[PDB]
């Protein structure tokens, strides 16, 4: 029940994950 | 389901002295949340060297693509990438201008340190991150570091005469010392604030000025809050324990 | 790409690293992230116990005044802990943080009066110096050497105001007449989390060596050493705070540019 401001910042989709995480 | 909410709650509670390891551990605990976690969990800023122009720039999730980071100076990824996300020509021009502007802002307020600005396109406007990193000189055997992460979303209108701005700013402040009287003391962490405003977009009030004013107002406010929380509230809590 | 074994190792780690007064929230978070109550039960039960002992969790025993600390020194095996002041053992549920089944217990008839004298002196010191402090004093022979181990806990939990704090101190006097070697460690953790996550983590190691005589007089002397060192630590922490604020924080960023006004953004841009 804490407010998470950083969860609703604008995103950039299409970013590849770091290699060690695959995608 | 509630997983992201719990992951973010965890980051608010685990010691920020282990902030980098905490995130790495969380992504291992819930691997399918990796993108969302990299996007929502702030980390200390890292300084890299742009070997093309010879200027320092800052690394975070916002200028990353795969394992490479984009420099705001040379507009290139390091290590090189075939197909890294790049701003449009119009946004890159705004980005160069912002970088120059926030470099003067940085000199004026911080008198040192490193800044970086990264913009990207949205369907109806654009977003940016304004990054500032300043290390203290180590006087009186105190290590100090300040990180600013200002993320702005700008929604542009068909008329081009007004825009909606939403700023979400985190500042991280780290202090550490080891002395005979106190032993080891590490006072560290971050605060995040948000605000939102419609502004006129004009030649007298262009996007960079609108964003600059909001960033300046926010960071001045957070500097004073940090002062209150770090040196007022935590100290009072310590003295309340004994 | 991450195995269950690795996930529960991480779950156990996070549980042990929960800030003072926030064990329940962290546990709830981790439980929902693992989403495997069996894995959590098997691979993370050591972590509940390790948390409580590391944190010197005070616990009320039905029938006895004041509380006792859960510590590594009280751990009797089989879910039981020692209360050395009331001379009892009890079952302790690490998850509910509840004591039960108190039973009379024997310890060390040799170190008996010394432990009691030190306990008596320490309890008065703790009630005088801490708002809601608790202490536990153990007397054991370690590697053949008679040792008094004094543990002190004091916490303030205010989650409605988004903060919690805890002091722990542990003092070991190894009796080598006519002296005693003193080793101690003092620790503080404070967490503020209204719209953020700021923590102080602090610890100080103490080495000293003092004269020993009779049980009551030595107890007085031990408490003076504890008092002097804990006062000096708390004083030095407040001095460090002043220095961090007037020196380091001020050098990291100005309040305003030298013009004593905020920026003219139009003049920046041209
Ligand atoms: Ba998603």
CA-to-CA distance for B110 and B108, rounded, in angstroms?
6
Closest to C124 (Cα-Cα) out of C53, C219, C213, C229: C219
Distances (CA, A) of B117 to B197, B223, C170, C214: 21, 20, 49, 70
Domains of chain C: 1-107 (3.30.1140.60), 108-252 (3.90.1150.210)
| Pair B144, C248: CB distance under 8 Å | yes
User: What is the spatial order of strands in the sheet that B114-122 belongs to?
Assistant: B114-122, B125-135, B143-156, B162-179, B183-200, C196-211, C179-192, C163-176, C145-158, C134-142
Contact B98, B206 (CB under 8 A): no
Note whether B187 contacts C155, CB cutoff 8 Å. no
Residue whose pair of structure tokens reads 């110096």 in the numeric block: C129
DSSP code of residue C73: G
Q: Which of B105, B220, B231 sits opposite C244 (nearest CB)?
A: B231
Sign, CA torsion B65/B71/B75/B79: negative
Burial class from Cβ neighbours inside 10 Å (0-12, 13-18, 19+) for residue C160 reads exposed
Alpha-carbon span C57 to C157, nearest angstrom: 13
Query: H or E element: which one contains B13?
Result: helix B3-13
Q: How do beta strands B55-59 and B46-50 pair?
A: antiparallel
For the four alpha carbons of B193, B199, B201 and B204, in that order, the dihedral sign comes to: negative
Interchain contact A15–B (C-beta under 8 A): yes
A5: nearest CA in chain C?
C195
Spatial neighbors of C32 by CB under 8 A, at least 6 apart, are B2, B3, B6
Distance between CA atoms of residues B211 and B192, nearest Å: 17
DSSP B145-197: EEEEEEEEEEEE-TTSSEEEEEEEEEEEEEEEEEETTTEEEEEEEEEEEEEEE
Tell me if B135 sits within 8 A of B145, measured CB to CB.
Answer: yes
What would the 3-class secondary structure string for A1-23 be?
Answer: CCCCHHHHCCCCCCCCCCHHHCC
CB < 8 Å to C1, chain A: 21-22
What was the resolution (in A) of this experimentally determined structure?
1.9
- For residue A5, the chain C residues in CB contact (below 8 A) are 195
Dihedrals phi, psi of C233, to nearest 5 degrees: -60, -50
Place of tokens 């800023």: B45
Most C CBs within 10 Å: which of B11, B14, B101, B180, as the mutation test of the C interface? B14
Catalogue all structural domains in chain B, each as residue range(s) with its CATH number. Answer: 1-87 (1.20.58.570), 88-242 (3.90.1150.210)
Region for residue B33 given its phi and psi (left: phi exceeds 0; alpha: psi -120 to 50; beta: otherwise): alpha
* Tokens coding B109: 């307020």
- Closest residue by Cα to residue B134 from B110, B107, B109, B117: B110
Where helices occur in chain C by DSSP H, the ranges are 4-16, 23-34, 37-54, 112-129, 215-243, 250-252, 265-269
| C-alpha–C-alpha distance, residues C84 and C137, integer Å | 7
CB C205 within 8 A of CB C184: yes
Asked if A5 reaches chain C (Cβ–Cβ under 8 Å), the answer is yes
* List of residues 6+ apart from C256 with CB closer than 8 A: B109, B220, C262
Exposure of C208 by Cβ count < 10 A (0-12 exposed, 13-18 middle, 19+ buried)?
middle
Chain C residues 190-249 with CB within 8 Å of chain A? 193, 195
Q: How far apart are CA B115 and CA B128, in angstroms?
A: 13
Interface test with A, best of B34, B88, B166 (most A CBs within 10 A): B34
Count of A–B CB contacts within 8 Å?
58
Give the helix ranges, DSSP H, for B87-159.
89-110
Distance in angstroms (rounded) separating the CA atoms of residues B130 and B97: 12
Cis bond before residue C178 (omega within 30° of 0): yes
Is the four-CA dihedral C93, C98, C103, C106 of positive or negative sign?
Answer: positive
Does A17 reach chain C within 8 Å, measured CB to CB?
Answer: no
Question: What is the DSSP pairing of strand B162-179 with strand B183-200?
Answer: antiparallel
b/e per residue C217-230 (b: at least 16 CB within 10 A): ebbebbbebbeebb
- Residues of C whose CB is below 8 A from A3: 195
Say if CB C205 and CB B151 are below 8 A apart: no
Could you give the CA distance from residue C186 to residue C130 in angstroms, rounded to a whole number?
A: 14
Method of determination is X-ray
Query: C96 to chain B nearest CA, in Å?
Result: 20
Q: How far apart are CA B116 and CA C53, in angstroms?
A: 46
- Cα of C197 vs centre of ligand 1, distance in Å, is 24
Query: What b/e string do you get for B83-92 counting C-beta neighbours within 10 Å, with b at 16 or more?
Result: ebbebeeebe
Cβ atoms of residues C244 and B187 within 8 Å: yes
**Residue C260 falls in which region: left (phi positive, over 0), alpha (psi -120 to 50) or beta:** left
Q: Which one, of C147, C134, C137, C133, lies nearest residue C117 by Cα? A: C137
Q: What is the Cα–Cα distance from C123 to B90, expressed in whole angstroms?
A: 72
Q: What is the 3-state secondary structure (H, E, C) of C118-149?
A: HHHHHHHHHHHHCCCCEEEEEEEEECCEEEEE
CA C252 to chain centre: 32
Exposed/middle/buried for C250, CB within 10 Å: 0-12, 13-18, 19+?
middle
In a 10 Å sphere around its CB, with 0-12 CB exposed, 13-18 middle and 19+ buried, how is residue C65 labelled?
exposed
Radius of gyration of chain C (CA): 23
Q: How many CA atoms lie within 13 A of C259 on its CB side?
A: 9
Q: Which structure tokens are listed for B85?
A: 């996300």
């Amino acid at each position: 029940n804490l407010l998470h401001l950083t969860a609703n910042r604008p995103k950039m989709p299409g970013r590849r994950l770091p290699g060690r995480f695959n995608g | 389901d509630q997983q992201l909410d719990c992951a973010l709650d965890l980051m608010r509670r685990l010691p920020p002295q282990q902030i980098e390891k905490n995130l790495s551990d969380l992504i291992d605990l819930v691997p399918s949340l990796c993108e969302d976690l990299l996007s929502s969990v702030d980390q200390p800023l890292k300084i890299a060297r742009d070997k093309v122009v010879g200027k320092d720039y800052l690394l975070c999730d916002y200028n990353r693509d795969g394992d490479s980071y984009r420099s705001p100076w040379s507009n290139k990824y390091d290590p090189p990438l075939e197909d890294g996300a790049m701003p449009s020509a119009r946004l890159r021009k705004l980005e160069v201008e912002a970088n120059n502007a926030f470099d003067q802002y940085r000199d004026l307020y911080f008198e040192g340190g490193v800044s970086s600005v990264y913009l990207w396109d949205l369907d109806h406007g654009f977003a940016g991150v304004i990054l500032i990193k300043k290390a203290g000189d180590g006087s009186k055997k105190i290590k100090g570091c300040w990180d600013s992460i200002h993320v702005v979303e700008v929604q542009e209108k068909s008329s081009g005469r007004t825009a909606h701005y939403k700023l979400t700013s985190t500042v991280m402040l780290w202090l550490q010392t080891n002395k005979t009287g106190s032993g080891t003391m590490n006072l560290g962490g971050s605060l995040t604030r948000q605000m939102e405003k419609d502004e006129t977009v004009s030649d007298s009030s262009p996007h960079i000025a609108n964003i600059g004013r909001l960033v300046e107002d926010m960071e001045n406010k957070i500097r004073s809050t940090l002062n209150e929380i770090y040196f007022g509230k935590t100290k009072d809590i310590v003295n309340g324990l004994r | 790409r991450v195995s269950d074994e690795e996930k529960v190792r991480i779950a156990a780690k996070f549980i042990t690293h929960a800030p003072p007064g926030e064990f329940n929230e962290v546990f709830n978070d981790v439980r929902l992230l693992l989403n495997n109550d069996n894995l959590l039960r098997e691979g993370a039960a050591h972590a509940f116990a390790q948390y409580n002992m590391d944190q010197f969790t005070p616990v009320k025993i039905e029938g006895y005044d004041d509380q006792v600390l859960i510590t590594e020194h009280g751990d009797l095996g089989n879910g039981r802990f020692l209360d050395p002041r009331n001379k009892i053992s009890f079952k302790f549920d690490h998850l509910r943080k509840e004591a039960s089944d108190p039973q009379p217990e024997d310890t060390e008839s040799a170190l008996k009066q010394w432990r009691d004298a030190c306990d008596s002196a320490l309890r008065a010191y703790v009630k005088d110096h801490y708002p809601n402090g608790f202490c536990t004093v153990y007397g054991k022979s370690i590697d053949g050497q008679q040792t008094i181990i004094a543990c002190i806990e004091s916490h303030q939990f205010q989650p409605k105001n988004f903060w919690n704090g805890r002091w722990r101190s542990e003092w070991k006097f190894t009796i080598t007449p006519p002296t005693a070697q003193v080793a101690a460690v003092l620790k503080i953790q404070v967490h503020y989390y209204e719209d953020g996550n700021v923590q102080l983590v602090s610890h100080k190691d103490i080495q000293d060596s003092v004269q020993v005589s009779s049980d009551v007089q030595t107890a007085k002397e031990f408490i003076k050493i504890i008092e002097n060192a804990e006062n000096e630590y708390q004083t030095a922490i407040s001095e460090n705070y002043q220095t961090m604020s007037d020196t380091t924080f001020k050098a990291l960023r100005r309040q305003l540019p030298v013009t004593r006004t905020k920026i003219d953004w139009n003049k920046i841009l041209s």
